[PDB]
Amino acid sequence: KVMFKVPGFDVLEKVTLVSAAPEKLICEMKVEEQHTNKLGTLHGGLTATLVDSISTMALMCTPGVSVDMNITYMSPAKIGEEIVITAHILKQGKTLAFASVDLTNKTTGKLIAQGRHTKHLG
Amino acid sequence: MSSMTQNLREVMKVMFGFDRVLEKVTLVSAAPEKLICEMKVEEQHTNKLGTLHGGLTATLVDSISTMALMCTEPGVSVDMNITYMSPAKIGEEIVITAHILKQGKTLAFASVDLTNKTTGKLIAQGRHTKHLG
Numbered sequence: 001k002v003m004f005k006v007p008g009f010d011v012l013e014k015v016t017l018v019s020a021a022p023e024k025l026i027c028e029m030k031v032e033e034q035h036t037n038k039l040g041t042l043h044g045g046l047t048a049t050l051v052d053s054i055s056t057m058a059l060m061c062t063p064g065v066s067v068d069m070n071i072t073y074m075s076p077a078k079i080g081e082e083i084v085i086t087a088h089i090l091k092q093g094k095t096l097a098f099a100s101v102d103l104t105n106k107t108t109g110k111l112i113a114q115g116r117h118t119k120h121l122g
Numbered sequence: 123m124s125s126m127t128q129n130l131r132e133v134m135k136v137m138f139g140f141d142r143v144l145e146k147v148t149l150v151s152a153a154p155e156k157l158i159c160e161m162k163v164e165e166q167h168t169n170k171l172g173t174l175h176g177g178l179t180a181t182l183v184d185s186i187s188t189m190a191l192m193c194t195e196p197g198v199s200v201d202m203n204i205t206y207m208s209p210a211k212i213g214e215e216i217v218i219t220a221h222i223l224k225q226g227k228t229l230a231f232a233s234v235d236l237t238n239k240t241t242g243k244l245i246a247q248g249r250h251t252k253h254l255g
Contacts (some may be wrong), residue, residue: 072249074224074231075236090244091207099246101230111223114233114245116205 005057013046016054016085017120025058025087028106031079041076044113047103050085055099058087063095064119071115075105082106095121126193126246127152129188134189141185142177149189150217156218157190163210167251172210174216180204182218183248186230190220197230197252205246208238215239228254 001020005027014034015107020025029035029050037043056063075084081098084106100116107118129238130152138144146167151158161167161182169175190198210216217237226229230252236245 068205072201072231074226090247092131093207098205098247112192113248114223114231114249116249118205 001012007053007060009048011049016050016087020058020061023062023092024052025048027054027085028086029085030082030083031077033079036079039076040079042079044071044073047073047113048072048115050103051101051117052112054085055095055101055117056119059089059119061097061098062089062097067118067120069115070118071113072109073113075108075110075112077105077112083112087092090116093121097121123167130157130193133192136141140174143181145186147182152189152211154194155190155222157185157186157193159189159218159220161218162215163212164214168212171209173211176206179206179210179246180248182236183234183239183250185251186218187220187222187234187248189229190222190232191252194222196254198255200229200251200253202248202250204246206246207244208239208246210236210245216245216251220235226254230254 008122016027016029031042033048084104086102088100090100098118102114104111131149147161149159164176167178217239219235221233223233232250233250
């Protein structure tokens with residue numbers, strides 16, 4: 001689905017691309033120098049923020065304020081890797097909505113991190 | 123040639139202590155990374171309001187993601203988080219499924235989802251990190 005994720009000017013690291021269904025929301029990003037941490041592997045500074053938006057992003061399609069968010073990291077991503085990022089509206093409820101993102105390594109398949117996120121509507 | 127599903131069915135029934143709260147709990151299926159279980163919510167499972175209780179829904183995430191852990195190549199808990207989308211009422215039959223997301227030299231991670239057996243509908247999604255102590 002064609003448009004693109006054009007909230008991206010002024011905390012904003014869109015360097016990220018796409019593929020949009022209902023309650024689901026693929027994107028992709030190539031880890032670069034700016035994205036990374038003390039080591040080479042993008043830290044979850046970025047990852048978090050990435051789960052924040054693209055969740056919220058994937059949601060302004062069906063937008064709220066954050067509430068709770070949690071992230072578990074399980075694989076590094078190196079500078080130079082290209083990664084995909086899947087978002088899935090889990091629940092859309094009256095006052096609250098729930099969403100769950102998966103960040104994998106494209107080349108590898110391998111799961112990098114996985115984080116859930118709740119926001120408040122109204 | 124492997125009777126992992128059968129076999130877990132006994133390890134479980136032996137070890138269900140606090141875990142003895144999980145007696146009405148069936149195993150439907152035991153893969154080497156996914157695990158399925160069901161459980162009709164009773165009333166000794168229930169909350170203050172008659173839905174399934176918060177704690178037990180975590181107890182079901184701890185234990186059953188740990189069961190899961192025993193299939194492949196146990197631990198201790200590191201962290202857990204759990205999110206609640208929908209009430210499981212009395213009489214309900216719930217499927218609980220577990221996913222080992224990750225392997226690891228000293229840590230293992232798994233995700234678990236509670237579904238309505240009949241709606242299909244989500245109840246709670248949980249994520250559980252253990253240390254391979």
